[PDB]
Structure formats: C-alpha cells, structure tokens
Amino acid sequence: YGFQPTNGVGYQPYRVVVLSFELLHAPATVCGPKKSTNLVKNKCVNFNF
C-alpha cells in the first residue's frame, strides 16, 4: 500500500483488532466484572459458577 494523506476515504489506512474468545476444556479463566459471592445450599436458588 502506498498510503498518502490526500487519499479518499476507503483508501486510507484502518487499524483492525480481532478478538477471538476460545473455550477449550480448562477449569476457568478471564471474564467480565466479578460481583458478590456467598454460597447458599439446601434451597432452590439461582446460581452462576
């Protein structure tokens, strides 16, 4: 590419980042923002592990 500053859009350089989330078969890894914790048992509950 011979990029030059006086190029019409669609010929100017764009930077690209491709994030690819993969899930092999480990025990866990990075995620979003943690919240709360605790741990209830013996009661119908709505859980996220």
Add this chain to the structure above:
Amino acid sequence: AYTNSFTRGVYYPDKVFRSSVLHS
C-alpha cells in the same frame, strides 16, 4: 525392531467427571 501394543494409549478426552457409562 517392531512390537505389538495390546491395549495402550488411552487418555481421558477431557475434564468432566463420570461414572459407569459406556461412553462413546
């Protein structure tokens, strides 16, 4: 030389516990 394995080279395909279950 060459030799014959008999029943060798079986590994757990992954995590996940499991019991009596002829799993394929």
